[PDB]
Design a binder for this molecule. Structure first.
Ligand SMILES: [Zn+2]
Lengths: 140, 49, 56, 98
């Protein structure tokens, strides 16, 4: 018995007793079906927020955008998703335009690095350009 | 042949468990083998009157 | 049926697999629940198994 | 409260009396109606096999109930197990037949 792997790895006589019955007679008021569907919906686990973390080569993952702008944009996206889930054109619960002045909110993006510097040039290219200056070549 | 690596076979007055792990690994030892089993979480739900 | 969890088995020759969960060595599930007042067993399998034949 | 301890190696199953003790499936018992209603299927499987032939007698406390009469002929054989089992089978957590 080999259990298959979930994610890719590095390499890649007898008589029927008088009590038993096989016919249902009860229908649940809080329906079994209804509850299950909601439960499996709540049971869905947390969403991964991979923004800002470095990659295998060291380049930070994400999009180049201002921090507060990214926070506002994802708040708007959350409002749109709430409206879509509520299946109404206007959402009662809004995570955006709350009315509380929240202008200091910051949310992770790809603009900043772990060294607190901009990511205009991806890190791997920065290290490559630094090392290049040092190289020397065979004598003419 | 490295004698100290096969310690439990050469050294006669050596208990079958002692190992000089920090200094040199010894590639002949006693291993514990066994077979458990993991049954699924079972439960019988009963209603309170 | 099984006289341990009061579960009904369609084929009596498959009672061994059921009692293996209770721990009796007679001769893929993760959770098995039984309801006292109704006949509706509920079972669990991992998120990626098969056609998902009436299993959570 | 009720728990059923399955009997292994030929032992008899026991149900926990509310006083704390546990007794086998024989004797004189007293059940509230709600207790059987809430655990209809579980109780029927583990009690009918002893009620029909064993030495189990149960006094289910109701207080009031409608009844339906069946008139048989004394000169001939008569068995009521079919009706008495249909009733127990048709008992539900929210209904009881006559
Ligand atoms: Zn069982």
């Amino acid at each position: 018995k080999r259990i298959p792997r979930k994610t890719k790895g590095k390499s890649s006589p007898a008589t029927a007793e008088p009590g038993t019955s096989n016919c249902e007679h009860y229908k649940a008021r809080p329906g079994i079906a209804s509850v299950q569907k909601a439960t499996e919906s709540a049971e869905l686990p947390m969403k991964n927020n991979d923004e800002g973390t470095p990659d295998k080569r060291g380049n930070t993952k994400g999009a180049l955008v201002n921090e507060h702008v990214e926070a506002r944009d994802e708040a708007d996206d959350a409002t749109k998703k709430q409206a879509k889930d509520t299946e109404k054109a206007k959402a009662q619960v809004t995570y955006s335009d709350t009315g509380i002045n929240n202008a200091n909110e910051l949310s992770r993006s790809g603009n900043v690095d772990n060294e607190g510097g901009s990511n205009q040039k991806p890190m791997s290219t920065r290290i490559a350009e630094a090392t290049s200056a040092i190289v020397s070549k065979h004598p003419a | 042949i490295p004698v100290e690596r096969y310690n439990i076979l050469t050294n006669p007055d050596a208990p079958p468990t002692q190992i000089q792990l920090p200094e040199v690994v010894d590639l002949y030892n006693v291993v514990t083998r066994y077979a458990y089993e993991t049954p699924p979480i079972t439960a019988v739900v009963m209603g309170v009157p | 049926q099984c006289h341990v969890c009061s579960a009904v088995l369609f084929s009596p020759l498959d009672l061994d697999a059921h009692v293996a969960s209770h721990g009796l060595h007679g001769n893929r599930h993760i959770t098995e629940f039984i309801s006292s007042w109704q006949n509706h067993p509920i079972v669990q399998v991992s998120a990626d198994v098969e056609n998902r034949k009436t299993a959570q | 409260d009720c728990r059923i301890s399955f009997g292994m190696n030929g032992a008899a199953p026991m149900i926990r009396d509310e006083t704390g003790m546990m007794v086998p499936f024989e004797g004189n018992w007293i059940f509230p109606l709600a207790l059987w209603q809430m655990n209809t299927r579980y109780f029927n499987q583990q009690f009918d096999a002893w009620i029909k032939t064993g030495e189990l007698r149960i006094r289910i406390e109701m207080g009031a109930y409608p009844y339906m009469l069946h008139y048989y002929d004394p000169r001939q054989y008569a068995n009521a197990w079919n009706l008495t089992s249909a009733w127990l089978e048709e008992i539900t957590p929210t209904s009881i037949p006559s």
